[PDB]
């Protein structure tokens, strides 16, 4: 995955909605004779939300491209192409360079296939 | 970046990169391209070697032919789309009767959907897929309208009958032709049978 | 011939049954599935024949009108009632000669 | 909307027009015929991130500091620590609301607008670093290609060393058949034995 | 025209988010199917007069004479039955077509007899067409019988009883039968 | 010489606009069937598909947004010749795209 | 944006998700195009396209000629005689000499030929020359040999069909086929000889001598003079 700060945003605006979830427990539950336990649920949110925030900071800790220099990270990609673009046809040239011998060598395997057939029937 | 062409392997990191090898691939191929019949093709395998010889000698040393450009080359394929019997009568008959008769099966089925609102001994005849799907008693009639009428009714009602009776005329006359010709043919047989029986010969 | 028996009984059942049918109108009811099952039923609500053949009927109208172009103003239907009526009498005379 | 959905351009599409163009191929060698030539393109939606500074104008201050970042350490410490500070001052804003409410409960929720307007600061630089994220994905995927080409080294070289060393065996060289001499191989090496 | 054909301006529904109750007759008012001297539209004219005095629909409608489009069978969230009618009294009704929400379309309900006639006509047309470009190829003979002329017959290639006093398979059929017996002959 | 004059009342600026603008409307498999009338199919209509071939080229390619149009493009590239521009493939064809929408 | 709003004037179809993060990745892909070229063949891959799905039946076809299939035949030119170098064993008498299609010519007997028709690479392990089909049945028996159409139909059919049935179970497999081979053609010998017996009995010379082919499992009764 990537753009994981947005995944953190999933723990921001959506957590902001979680505050809205926390909101809906006091509409009329008081004098209409638990909410005391719901306060412990508020403590549970004090745990959860804040720890989620800590998690947010932890993913802040390792933002990809810590060098943060696209102006030069693209240059990194330029050097990487200075490798790869050279390697392209070179690595694939080996294929034909091999088959030019090895196909006929395989037919040689077929010729000793002839002789194997000779061995089949003494 | 030729590796972008090698990103087809990255597409193979995004896909199975086709089934590739298959005997069935050799079957559509048994249909596709020259020639046919893999045994006969094997007989042709030396001739196939000839195909790899001077048969492919044609190359490129000629005018670019601007007239061929560009998407109009496909328009030539459109020219192919335009410019380019026993059983077959019965065949196409199977076609037409298939269409009409199965449509009538849909008549029976949907009318069964209508009559399934009451009696259950009607929906039973519907095609098997339907009962598996839509529950019976679904269709229902509505009371509505004369509904409309037009002159084309009476006009076609006349002209079509005219064409019909005239078709009967053409039928009787051309059949008169074929029958008269059959007489013309058949008579020779029994004249030669005058040469037979009227000359006293076994029959 | 068996098909002639089919068209026989069917045309027989057209009869005064059409007198009731003309007021009729198809519609699926409450048990009819709703999500996307409809369009095939719209085809069932589609009284359209073969488009080529409806085109053929259009051809019969326009080309009879072409015959009208050949014959700009010529009523016939009024005495065509006596066309078919002369069929109706001549059939009887035909039957007369048959009975003779 | 479509007016109606089928194109009204069908006669432009007609085959025989282009068939006339076939006659026209030698026409300007010395109509729709050049209108079958490729159309001018839209400029058109070339506008950049319009939801950035204009939205900042629509308020953005911390986002303005984010604009300053476009020159931890470097630009990072705001992006991290000031972000924490926004989230936590935001928590303080939650104290601003949930801490006191029932006493004339309309003012604090009206201040929630101030809260989210302060929260507008967040998103933009993050979506500025989003293309940078994409660049990181590009850097990640870029040499998996190189991994595939390395696989060719991994195998083709094995076929090299191994098929070549095994090219000589008990069969000797694969060319040991020596063509016509191999016609004698079924006999001179076999039938000749006695 | 009134059958299975498109007539859609979806953006209206995109605004409405879909139909509710009386708003079906809004997009229907956009439709040709909507009538101008319908009680829906003459009392739409009442909306242009009294406005407030229309109630839901059917109360103001059926009590007043004329063409109407009454609602009876909802089918959420897609279809909604809405029959056309003609009140002749505050009590009397003379119902017409069941216009129906075909979803971004509404249609008159076809006669059964229409489609039935379509079936009859197309079928007998298949019969006649079978008699068209097919008949009169087996030319009759008292002697030769029906005949089937060809540039080449291949492909393939009430009389008398008493007379003179392949099996393309070379009895291959029985051989195959024996193959059936013999494939499991060791096995059975 | 005067093919533009063949138009009953058109000529028009045409350009890139309504082209791609309807190419996205081509995308719908449900749209397939309607093309089985007279508006266009295997007749002179075929020319539309045979000149809309330019999209694979650079610049035009960028403005593509819904590769379902590229899959209908696959349909023309495939023997639409067959049922693909005839009987194929009912609402399931939309599902054949919905699966592509699903994945 | 603006061009899009210009394209917006249409029926509610496009047709996919309103979300366009992938399209943002398509403008980013335009940036990749700035990073691309070569190649034009790769431009769709640069566009990351032409592969949204393939599970659909549809059609899936393209031009395919010419060296392709022949080179695959070379792949068989390896594989088949590979499996011959392997297994093999048995069902002799034999002198195979395979090229392309598996050779199985006989003597006075008849033609036999092999054609593998399944999934590819399963050598050594399951290297016992499993999959094959009756190819062009063309039996070489001197007294009678031609093989038109229907024979090649109904015979080769159920032959290969129950050969597949033999794949369904634990292996015999090929030797059964090798049995059915000589079985059928020699039955055909039985009725060649029977037809000879009627060459004598139905006509010249004399009668009484006979060789009627009984409906029983095959028998030829050469009853003589009384």
UniProtKB/Swiss-Prot annotation, chain D:
Compartment(s) of residence: Nucleus
Keywords carried by this UniProt record: Activator, Nucleus, Transcription, Transcription regulation
Record note on quaternary structure: Component of the Mediator complex.
Keyword Coiled coil attributed: no
Gene3D superfamilies (UniProt xref): 6.10.140.1520, 6.10.140.200
Spans through the membrane: none
Organism of provenance: Schizosaccharomyces pombe (strain 972 / ATCC 24843)
Functional description taken from the UniProt entry: Component of the Mediator complex, a coactivator involved in the regulated transcription of nearly all RNA polymerase II-dependent genes. Mediator functions as a bridge to convey information from gene-specific regulatory proteins to the basal RNA polymerase II transcription machinery. Mediator is recruited to promoters by direct interactions with regulatory proteins and serves as a scaffold for the assembly of a functional preinitiation complex with RNA polymerase II and the general transcription factors.
Record-given protein name: Mediator of RNA polymerase II transcription subunit 7
Chief location of this protein within or outside the cell: nucleus
Keyword Transit peptide among record annotations: no
InterPro entries assigned to the protein according to its UniProt record, in alphabetical order: Med7/Med21-like, Mediatior_Med7, Mediatior_Med7_sf
An MF annotation (GO) of this entry: transcription coactivator activity
GO annotation (BP), single: regulation of transcription by RNA polymerase II
Name of a matching Pfam family: Med7
From Swiss-Prot, chain E:
InterPro entries, per the entry: Mediator_Med6 (IPR007018), Mediator_Med6_fun (IPR016612), Mediator_Med6_sf (IPR038566)
Molecular function terms from GO: transcription coactivator activity
Subunit structure: Component of the Mediator complex.
Recorded superkingdom: Eukaryota
Record-given protein name: Mediator of RNA polymerase II transcription subunit 6
A GO CC term attached to the entry: core mediator complex
Compartment(s): Nucleus
Lineage summary: Eukaryota, Fungi, Dikarya, Ascomycota, Taphrinomycotina
Gene3D superfamilies from the UniProt entry: Mediator complex, subunit Med6
Species the sequence originates in: Schizosaccharomyces pombe (strain 972 / ATCC 24843) (Fission yeast)
Gene: med6
Main location, first listed in the record: nucleus
UniProtKB/Swiss-Prot annotation, chain F:
Cysteine pairs bridged by disulfides in the record: none
GO cellular component: core mediator complex; mediator complex; nucleus
Location relative to the cell: Nucleus
Signal peptide (residue range): none
GO biological process: positive regulation of transcription initiation by RNA polymerase II; regulation of transcription by RNA polymerase II
Highest taxon listed in the record's lineage: Eukaryota
Keywords assigned: Activator, Nucleus, Transcription, Transcription regulation
Gene Ontology terms for molecular function: transcription coactivator activity
Family to which the UniProt record says this protein belongs: Belongs to the Mediator complex subunit 31 family.
Quaternary structure note: Component of the Mediator complex.
Entry function: Component of the Mediator complex, a coactivator involved in the regulated transcription of nearly all RNA polymerase II-dependent genes. Mediator functions as a bridge to convey information from gene-specific regulatory proteins to the basal RNA polymerase II transcription machinery. Mediator is recruited to promoters by direct interactions with regulatory proteins and serves as a scaffold for the assembly of a functional preinitiation complex with RNA polymerase II and the general transcription factors.
Name of the protein this chain belongs to: Mediator of RNA polymerase II transcription subunit 31
Organism whose genome encodes this protein: Schizosaccharomyces pombe (strain 972 / ATCC 24843)
Full protein segment contained here: 2 to 104 of 139
Swiss-Prot record, chain G:
Places the protein is found: Nucleus
Highest taxon, organism lineage: Eukaryota
Function description: Component of the Mediator complex, a coactivator involved in the regulated transcription of nearly all RNA polymerase II-dependent genes. Mediator functions as a bridge to convey information from gene-specific regulatory proteins to the basal RNA polymerase II transcription machinery. Mediator is recruited to promoters by direct interactions with regulatory proteins and serves as a scaffold for the assembly of a functional preinitiation complex with RNA polymerase II and the general transcription factors.
Family: Belongs to the Mediator complex subunit 14 family.
Record note on quaternary structure: Component of the Mediator complex.
Designated name of the protein: Mediator of RNA polymerase II transcription subunit 14
Organism placement in taxonomy: Eukaryota, Fungi, Dikarya, Ascomycota, Taphrinomycotina
């Amino acid at each position: 995955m990537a753009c994981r700060c947005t995944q953190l945003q999933d723990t921001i605006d959506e957590v902001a909605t979680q505050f809205y979830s926390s909101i809906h427990y006091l509409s009329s539950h008081h004098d209409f004779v638990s909410a005391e336990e719901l306060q412990f649920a508020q403590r549970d949110l004090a745990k959860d939300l804040v720890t989620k925030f800590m998690q947010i900071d932890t993913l802040i800790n390792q933002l990809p491209g810590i060098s943060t220099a696209p102006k030069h990270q693209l240059e990194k990609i330029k050097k990487l192409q200075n490798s790869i673009e050279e390697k392209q046809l070179e690595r694939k040239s080996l294929e034909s360079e091999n088959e030019d011998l090895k196909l006929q060598l395989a037919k040689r395997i077929e010729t000793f296939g002839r002789l194997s057939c000779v061995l089949f029937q003494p | 970046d030729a590796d972008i062409s090698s990103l087809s392997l990255s597409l193979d990191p995004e896909i199975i990169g086709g089934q590739n090898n298959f005997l069935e691939n050799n079957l559509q191929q048994i249909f596709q391209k020259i020639i046919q019949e893999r045994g006969p093709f094997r007989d042709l395998k030396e001739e196939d070697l000839q195909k790899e010889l001077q048969k492919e000698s044609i190359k490129d040393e000629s005018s670019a032919k601007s007239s061929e450009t560009e998407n109009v080359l496909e328009f030539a394929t459109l020219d192919s789309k335009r410019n380019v019997d026993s059983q077959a009568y019965k065949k196409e008959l199977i076609e037409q009767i298939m269409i009409a008769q199965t449509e009538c099966s849909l008549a029976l089925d949907m009318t069964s959907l209508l009559l399934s609102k009451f009696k259950e001994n009607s929906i039973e005849t519907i095609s098997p897929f339907l009962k598996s799907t839509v529950p019976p008693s679904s269709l229902q009639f509505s009371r509505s309208q004369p509904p409309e009428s037009k002159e084309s009714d009476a006009t076609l009602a006349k002209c079509w009958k005219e064409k019909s009776l005239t078709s009967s005329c053409k039928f009787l006359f051309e059949a008169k032709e074929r029958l008269t010709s059959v007489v013309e043919t058949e008579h020779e047989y029994y004249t030669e049978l005058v040469k037979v029986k009227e000359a006293s010969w076994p029959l | 011939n068996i098909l002639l028996s089919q068209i026989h009984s069917l045309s027989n059942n057209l009869a005064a049954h059409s007198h009731t049918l003309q007021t009729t109108s198809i519609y699926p009811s409450l048990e009819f599935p709703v999500k996307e099952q409809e369009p095939l039923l719209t085809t069932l609500l589609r009284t359209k024949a073969l488009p080529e053949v409806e085109e053929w009927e259009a051809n019969t109208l326009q080309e009879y009108e072409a015959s009208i172009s050949s014959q700009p103003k010529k009523k016939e239907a009024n005495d065509a009632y006596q066309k078919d009526q002369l069929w109706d009498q001549a059939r009887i005379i035909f039957m007369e000669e048959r009975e003779n | 909307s479509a007016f109606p959905p089928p194109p009204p351009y069908y006669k432009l599409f007609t085959r025989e027009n282009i068939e006339k163009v076939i006659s026209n191929m030698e026409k300007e060698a010395k109509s729709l015929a050049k209108l079958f030539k490729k159309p001018s393109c839209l400029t058109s939606g070339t506008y950049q991130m319009f939801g950035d500074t204009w939205r900042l104008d629509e308020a953005n201050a911390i986002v303005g500091t984010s604009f300053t970042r476009v020159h931890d350490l470097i630009k990072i410490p705001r992006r991290a620590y000031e972000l924490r500070f926004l989230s936590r001052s935001l928590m303080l804003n939650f104290l601003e609301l949930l801490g006191i409410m029932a006493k004339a409960p309309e003012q604090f929720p009206s201040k929630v607008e101030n809260i989210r307007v302060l929260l507008l600061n967040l998103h933009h630089l993050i979506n500025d670093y989003r293309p940078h994220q994409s660049r990181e994905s590009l850097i990640m995927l870029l040499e998996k290609q190189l991994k595939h080409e390395e696989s060719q080294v991994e195998l083709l070289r094995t076929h090299n060393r191994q098929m070549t060393e095994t090219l000589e065996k008990y069969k000797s060289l694969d060319f040991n058949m020596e063509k016509e001499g191999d016609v004698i191989q079924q006999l001179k090496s076999s039938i000749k034995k006695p | 025209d009134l059958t299975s054909i498109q007539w859609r301006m979806p953006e209206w529904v995109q605004s409405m988010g879909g139909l509710r109750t009386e708003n079906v007759l809004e997009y229907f008012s956009q439709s040709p199917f909507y009538s101008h001297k319908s009680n829906n539209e003459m009392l739409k004219m009442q909306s242009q007069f009294n406005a407030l005095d229309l109630g839901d629909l059917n109360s103001q409608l059926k009590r007043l004479t004329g063409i109407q489009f009454v609602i009876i069978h909802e089918r959420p969230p897609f279809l909604w039955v809405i029959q056309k009618q003609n009140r002749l009294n505050e009590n009397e009704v003379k119902p017409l077509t069941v216009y129906f929400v075909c979803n971004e379309n509404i249609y008159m309900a076809p006669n059964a007899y229409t489609l039935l006639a379509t079936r009859m006509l197309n079928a007998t047309y298949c019969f006649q067409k079978a008699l068209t470009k097919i008949e009169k190829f087996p030319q009759y003979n008292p002697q030769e019988g029906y005949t089937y002329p060809k540039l080449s017959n291949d492909n393939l290639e009430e009389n008398k009883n008493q007379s003179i006093e392949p099996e393309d398979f070379s009895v291959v059929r029985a051989f195959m039968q024996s193959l059936h017996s013999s494939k499991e002959a060791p096995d059975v | 010489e005067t093919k533009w004059l063949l138009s009953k009342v058109p000529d028009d600026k045409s350009r890139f606009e309504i082209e791609l603008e309807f190419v996205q409307m081509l995308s719908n498999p449900w749209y397939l069937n309607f093309l089985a009338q007279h508006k266009y199919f295997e007749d002179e209509a075929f020319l539309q598909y045979l000149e809309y071939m330019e999209y694979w080229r650079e610049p035009e390619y960028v403005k593509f947004i819904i590769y379902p149009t590229c899959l209908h493009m696959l349909t023309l590239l495939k023997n639409p010749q067959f049922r693909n521009d005839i009987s194929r493939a009912d609402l399931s064809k939309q599902v054949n795209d919905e699966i592509y929408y699903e994945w | 944006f603006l061009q899009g709003q210009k394209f917006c004037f249409q029926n509610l179809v496009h047709v996919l998700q309103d979300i366009r993060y992938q399209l943002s990745f398509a403008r980013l892909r335009n940036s990749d195009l700035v990073t691309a070229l070569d190649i034009l063949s790769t431009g769709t891959s640069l566009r990351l396209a032409n592969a949204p799905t393939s599970k659909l039946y549809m059609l899936s076809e393209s031009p395919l000629s010419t060296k392709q299939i022949l080179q695959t035949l070379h792949a068989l030119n390896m594989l088949i005689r590979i499996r011959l170098s392997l297994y093999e064993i048995i069902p002799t008498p034999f002198q195979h000499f395979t090229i392309a299609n598996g050779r199985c010519t006989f003597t006075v007997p008849n033609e036999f030929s092999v054609s593998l028709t399944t999934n590819s690479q399963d050598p050594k392990s399951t290297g016992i020359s499993f999959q094959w089909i009756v190819v062009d049945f063309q039996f070489h028996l001197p007294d009678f040999s031609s093989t038109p159409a229907k024979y090649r139909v109904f015979i080769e059919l159920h032959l290969n069909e129950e050969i597949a049935a033999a794949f369904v179970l634990q292996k015999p497999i090929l030797p059964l086929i090798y049995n059915i081979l000589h079985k059928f053609c020699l039955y055909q010998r039985l009725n060649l000889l029977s037809q000879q017996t009627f060459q004598l009995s139905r006509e010249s010379w004399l009668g009484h001598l006979r060789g009627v082919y009984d409906e029983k499992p095959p028998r030829l009764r050469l009853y003589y003079w009384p």
